[PDB]
Design a binder for this molecule. Structure first.
Ligand SMILES: Nc1ncnc2c1ncn2[C@@H]1O[C@H](COP(=O)(O)OP(=O)(O)NP(=O)(O)O)[C@@H](O)[C@H]1O
Ligand code: NA
Lengths: 286, 280
């Protein structure tokens, strides 16, 4: 149990207590944090967590207490991943997903991976829950898609709002101004839309920001937060919208256009949702 | 439904907050009958209001019919909904029905359906409905063309019934330019208030008898502060242009640009969500 010693420290215990109270409270009173933490040393720990910006103090006309900050939630997830030897160091923020921040991380051996920290919700309670669910969904769908030979990063690990995955050696399509053969890349992006639809899925946000181009000009999909089922009554519109977004990008960036693009009637169903739901339930159990 | 059947149905809901599958012993403990909880559970399964599940764990879950009943029984007790009358349509993550109160006044009912696991289905469906009620309140108070919000419970939102049809069902309009301009002005007004619809289309824009547009579904709005807000804004503009060209053969060179945006609804909506989370 030596690997879990940092999870036993007082600051981690108090941070976990703030997270626990945040399940039913928008602002966690110190008395409740102290009661949950069951360490006394509590107030001194709270003051250091505030100093390190891991928690923030909040006053309401009826309540006073603390909330976990984004840095505090990141700390809990990153220390958990560190205990498993998955993440030893966190580097530069490389980019953004629709509802997440992307960083390069390294394990003890120095091998690099991508870390996605999910951030969703406009209240403390829904932020805690939605960020975790968004990461859980990404890990479950990434696993289900990777097993079906889809071009997605290999999923490595998960904790709270954090997903660790394979670091793709490439750049998002939005940062690419020159490509050797625009037609091949356009065909590869269109084939991804088709493969998804044949598996019952419509991306919903298919664009130059979530498609990574490697040194061989091969595309990897790295963000898919709000996929639509091909069974949705308005699935055709969602499918056509994804096709059109990539057509607009190829015209604007590469001056490339084609009359050869996918049609929703051309889909032929080959289940991903069943596998992803099974993985989500396994993760929810733990 | 008897008071005991409703007490047990509520106990299943309560146990579902922390359990993927709710054990009968826990349902019995929560319901606190004073007993016959097992007999009630078996009738609730028979009526498909709850379902039995068995993996290490065994127990019950609420079905969509059971969750609907709980929300509709609450709305009926408040005199908001007396009758429900079949599906009129769909939102991105909801089913839409016409409902009537006791006095025969009609409203629209949206039942939110989100989540692929029992725990997340219960929470996400409730949150999706709460978010819709909070944003509809925040938008309606700022004179946006949205239905007036009436009431909310669980995954259910009751709202004003717009006398009109979705733009997708409209094949002829007197002046396409006016409707186009009204749809573009809505995108601009939203952006000036810090919002991007994200799903702006012919399926969620209702056209009334005077050719005025009402926005009826907005599940995944994007903030104008999002790092990729401009793309979301342009995508919404382009979808409208695509529909107007395809349906009415109408095109214009007068369309919004993200740089033309002069910047609160999110603050109001978050405040309403926190008020509703407190009473949940
Ligand atoms: N979400 C992702 N999953 C896996 N690898 C990624 C992801 N996003 C970027 N990368 C990789 O991160 C590495 C270094 O990224 P970096 O250039 O520092 O930031 P970035 O420009 O936002 N990302 P990128 O352009 O893809 O390199 C590259 O090898 C990328 O392919
Ligand atoms: Na699988």
């Amino acid at each position: 149990v030596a690997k879990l010693r940092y999870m036993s420290r007082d600051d981690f215990r108090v941070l976990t207590a703030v997270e626990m109270g945040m399940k039913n409270h928008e602002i966690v009173p110190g008395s409740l944090i102290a009661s949950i933490a069951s360490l006394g040393g509590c107030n001194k720990v709270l003051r250091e967590l505030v100093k390190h910006k891991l928690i923030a103090w909040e006053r309401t006309k009826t309540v006073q207490g603390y909330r976990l900050t984004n840095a505090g939630y990141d700390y809990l997830a990153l220390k958990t991943l560190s205990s498993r030897q998955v993440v030893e160091s966190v580097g530069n923020q490389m980019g953004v997903g629709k509802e997440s921040d992307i960083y390069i991380v390294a394990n003890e051996e120095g091998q690099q991976f991508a870390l996605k920290l999910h951030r969703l919700g406009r209240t403390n309670v829904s932020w805690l829950y939605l960020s975790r669910l968004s990461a859980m969904k990404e890990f479950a769908y990434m696993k289900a898609l990777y097993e079906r030979k889809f071009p997605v990063p290999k999923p490595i690990d998960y904790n709270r709002h954090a997903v660790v995955m394979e670091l793709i050696n490439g750049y998002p399509l939005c940062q690419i101004h020159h490509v050797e053969d625009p037609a091949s890349v356009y065909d590869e992006a269109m084939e991804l839309i088709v493969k998804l639809a044949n598996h019952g899925l419509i991306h919903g946000d298919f664009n130059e920001f979530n498609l990574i181009l490697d040194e061989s000009d091969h595309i990897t999909m790295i963000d898919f937060p709000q996929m639509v089922s091909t069974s949705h009554p308005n699935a055709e519109w969602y499918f056509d919208r994804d096709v059109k977004c990539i057509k607009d990008f190829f015209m604007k960036r590469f001056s490339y256009e084609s009359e050869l693009f996918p049609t929703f009637k051309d889909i032929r169903r080959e289940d991903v949702e069943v596998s992803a739901s099974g993985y989500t339930k396994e993760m929810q159990a733990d």
